[PDB]
Amino acid sequence: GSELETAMETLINVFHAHSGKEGDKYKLSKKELKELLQTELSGFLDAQKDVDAVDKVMKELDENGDGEVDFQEYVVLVAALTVAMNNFFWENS
Template structure:
């Protein structure tokens, strides 16, 4: 039976490949759809309407319009860190009340 972290890894891989389909990379449009569906609050909370463009530019190391699985992991790791930081601050604020 897979551990929780192994299950999370499997879900991350399957999510990437579901949106990349058989290309094994994400285009900017694939990334936009993925972010809209998998991180629904992310774009809603962005003041910058070009957030997906900026993410793609930051992560597309080869500048070929293709986001690799490794780059996708960088995005998910960054978002996970941000969510963790937010949660820690939120929990501390709740504890002070």
């Protein structure tokens, strides 16, 4: 498998483990998601009031409007954040 595929598997393992740790194993609640990204993602720095925006972005990602996310919503949710790291990269180099 390509390195991209190797990296991809990582998303499932972390999603499954963290999701499994709290709440229903099958579903990840927003509360679990917020804690997951805040701790695991550099966004921790954005934990301040900026973190509130996290609530705002969930609405757009969730077509259901349910407030809950599925693996499909999660993969795109992290993908959007990934772009931010790219922005950060600009700061270095």
